[PDB]
Amino acid sequence: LPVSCTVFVVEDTMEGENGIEASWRFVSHALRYGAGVAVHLSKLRPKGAENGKGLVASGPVSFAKIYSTLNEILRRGGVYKNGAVVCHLDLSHPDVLEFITASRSELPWVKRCVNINDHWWKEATPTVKNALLEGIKRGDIWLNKTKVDRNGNRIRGNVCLEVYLPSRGTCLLQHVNLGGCELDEIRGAFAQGMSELCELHGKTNVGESGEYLPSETDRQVGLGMLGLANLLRTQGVTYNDFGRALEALNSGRPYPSTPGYVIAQELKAGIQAAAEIAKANKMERAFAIAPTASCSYRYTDLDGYTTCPEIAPPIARQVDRDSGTFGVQSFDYGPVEIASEVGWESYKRVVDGIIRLLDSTGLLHGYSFNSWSDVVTYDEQFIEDWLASPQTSLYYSLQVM
Amino acid sequence: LPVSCTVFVVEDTMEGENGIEASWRFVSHALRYGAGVAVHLSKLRPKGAENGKGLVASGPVSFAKIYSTLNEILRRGGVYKNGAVVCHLDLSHPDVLEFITASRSELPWVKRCVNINDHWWKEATPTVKNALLEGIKRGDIWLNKTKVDRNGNRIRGNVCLEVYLPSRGTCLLQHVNLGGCELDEIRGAFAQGMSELCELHGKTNVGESGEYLPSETDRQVGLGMLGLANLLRTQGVTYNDFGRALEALNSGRPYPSTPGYVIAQELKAGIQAAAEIAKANKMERAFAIAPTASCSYRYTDLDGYTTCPEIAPPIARQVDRDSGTFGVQSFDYGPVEIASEVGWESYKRVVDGIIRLLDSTGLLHGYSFNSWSDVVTYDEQFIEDWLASPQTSLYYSLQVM
Ligand SMILES: Cc1cn([C@H]2C[C@H](O)[C@@H](COP(=O)(O)OP(=O)(O)OP(=O)(O)O)O2)c(=O)[nH]c1=O
Ligand SMILES: Cc1cn([C@H]2C[C@H](O)[C@@H](COP(=O)(O)OP(=O)(O)OP(=O)(O)O)O2)c(=O)[nH]c1=O
């Protein structure tokens, strides 16, 4: 199916409609088509908890092994080999420590994400914090925040962390190419994208298979953006200037009409237009920023160069992608600013400003924030700053220098 | 349930009534109650077989890992911890070699049995034979023969190898205590046991759960025997004399009326009476010899000593059984002959004679033959002799001296 991702929550019982065995069947079905899953194990009771009629429960870390085996077998046998599994878990779970410290031999083919917020982080003991920092520094444990819908009932993130869905949901995404649109066309492009997304929401028919929710009950769609670096290059605006202009616009402070200010105002106007169009069709959540590693390569800017993925600056001007089918393809991002030159502060400020702009309308799913391992030093201060900032995830740990 | 064992055969398809996923659910259900399973993987296509719509199949050895994980988790969490899994496989399967050589790290918590006969053994290449001999010498691979019902449709052995059942079947067993019955009472005891088994066959209601076959369609029961060594001791008959008498009786040759001959004639008469009673109730198969390690300890002979398990001679006169609940219990088998003193030949001849007597009526399931590793040298000649002899399995590799 076109469904890129799906979300499943497993109840604390072996059998049922959403039982662990039903979880095995659903994961097998999702992997046989290539779509990834995010099996949330936050409800399984802790390991060693005795009920009285002796059933010494094993805990989520035990079933992680079953999911790992299923993933390995089916992905190596599956038609689509791009599927992945992400076994989310909470930070308040008493088992989290074990979940953090399991070596790659025990759980070889499953990524791991931790749902954290202010309360659980504060309550966590120092040992758990140190284990989390060590894990993230080695690139094993991802982070994600917790957000409740307007009714207060919990919603859960997907595989790639920027879309928030309920149980057995699905994800519909569409990307707007900033590099390929002129400054005046931004609002029109945003309106066209949002209208197309609203129209396409009701014609997917994903839920007909009986595994997914019906389309009428979802009321969600994600309008992401890609190709910011090319736009900044074309207008001759550096990341520092764009970040300062975005911060000034968001704070409401007066600012001179520099090109960065014009771009920021155009982005705000387009976001507002898209928000109005979505509100017309009764869309709960509209804006979601997802990585475009597999989608950016098929688009081009005005000058003919390849558009940079999402809004971050490309690590290197030229990228050589190796695929077993089409071989090795060497593409160029043009004379754009790259990670080492811009610096950590400019990138962080720019992403924070854009995420604040998108969130201002209240229709934000999330963002798949990266992290440059060769520049910043992982510390509890870094996690505190990440939690304080409007970001909503921590995806990968790259090397830039 | 009282069901000691069950048999499942998995088809070559992911979904269905007997699909691999149905196999996972059935194995989980069987393990949650302690009853073991014998998941026959002889129908899964070989690893690496391509169909054209790319599905590079993994093979049975891959799903052995899923079954191992399920067994580990559920047995350590299961209420009854006596459950076990035995992943049968054929000798003609092109994957058998891998199945034989997998180390204990890959498949830690699943036993392995090989279904062999004359044709497959002859067709097997030397490397497979050497791998099988090495495996059996280390006590990893068990053997079992192939037998077809009166209609020619294949039937499959259970976990402990002496009962032959169809898919989703069950096993009903009852044991006759030779040590606790006088020489004249043998026929009456056999008749009583067979009548009780026939009566109890139709009142188990195992198939009401929807997983097992209905009781009306089974038409099977197993009348085993235990406590031969005590009987031989009481009558003052050594294993050699009893074996010679049994061989003479079976061959039809004239023989003097020695005590061994009297015992053999009584056994034959009792077997014939039980066979007639079973045939009265239309029983397809009636006689099955199973190990009594967990059942012999609750019975006593005429002199008050504990009866020896099945028909083999006990390894040591005194046995100290350690259980976490009742602690350590030291029981005595009395002044009975033991393994080293009797020798391999006498034991082999006695078991062969008794199995021939039981098979003479055509109502034999099988026998769980042991093997003394410290006496016999494993060679292709040994396997040839085992195949030639009326035995039907090869269970464990013990040490006697
Ligand atoms: C039976 C069993 C349960 N468990 C644990 C893990 C599951 O999350 C949890 C679900 O057990 P349940 O299936 O709900 O056990 P139960 O219904 O018989 O008893 P109760 O209602 O009190 O739970 O039990 C094991 O880990 N291993 C086992 O073998
Ligand atoms: C899809 C898939 C199949 N297989 C192998 C193992 C199973 O024994 C076997 C069953 O596949 P099927 O489910 O029968 O595949 P199919 O129905 O789409 O195509 P066909 O009818 O030709 O089989 O395929 C894998 O090993 N891994 C996989 O991911």
Residue numbers in the entry:
A (entry chain B), B (entry chain A): 26 to 426
Sentences from the paper on this structure:
RNRs are used by all free-living organisms and many viruses for the conversion of ribonucleotides to 2ʹ-deoxyribonucleotides in the de novo biosynthesis of DNA precursors. RNRs are especially fascinating from an evolutionary perspective as they exhibit high diversity in primary sequence and cofactor requirement, yet they share a common fold and radical-based catalytic mechanism for nucleotide reduction. Despite being a diverse enzyme family, the core structure of the catalytic subunit (known as α) is a conserved 10-stranded α/β barrel with the thiyl radical on the so-called ‘finger loop’ which connects the two halves of the barrel (Uhlin and Eklund, 1996). Our comprehensive phylogeny shows the parallel development of three major clades, corresponding to the three known classes, with a small, phylogenetically distinct clade, which we denote as class Ø (for convenience, pronounced ‘oh’), placed as an ancestral clade to the class I and II RNRs.
To examine the structural features of the class Ø RNR, we used a combination of AlphaFold2, SAXS, and cryo-EM to characterize the Synechococcus phage S-CBP4 α subunit. Addition of substrate (guanosine diphosphate [GDP]) does not shift this equilibrium, but the presence of the corresponding specificity effector (thymidine triphosphate [TTP]), strongly favors dimerization. Using solution conditions that saturate nucleotide binding (200 μM TTP, 200 μM GDP), we obtained a cryo-EM map of the S-CBP4 α2 dimer to 3.46 Å resolution (Fourier shell correlation [FSC] = 0.143). An atomic model (residues 22–426 out of 470) was refined against the cryo-EM map using an AlphaFold2 prediction as the starting model. Overall, the S-CBP4 α subunit displays the most minimal RNR architecture discovered to-date with few insertions about the catalytic barrel. The minimal set of insertions includes traits shared by class I and II RNRs, such as loop 1, where we find cryo-EM density for bound TTP. Additionally, the S-CBP4 α subunit contains a long β-hairpin following the βH strand of the catalytic barrel that in class II RNRs is thought to be important for cofactor binding and in class I RNRs is thought to be important for interactions with the β subunit. Although we do not observe density for the C-terminus past the βJ strand of the catalytic barrel, two consecutive tyrosine residues (Y420 and Y421) on βJ are well resolved and stacked adjacent to the catalytic cysteine (C185) at the tip of finger loop. Finally, we observe a disulfide between active-site cysteines (C30 and C196) that in class I and II RNRs serve as reducing equivalents during nucleotide reduction. Consistent with an oxidized active site, cryo-EM density for the substrate is not observed.
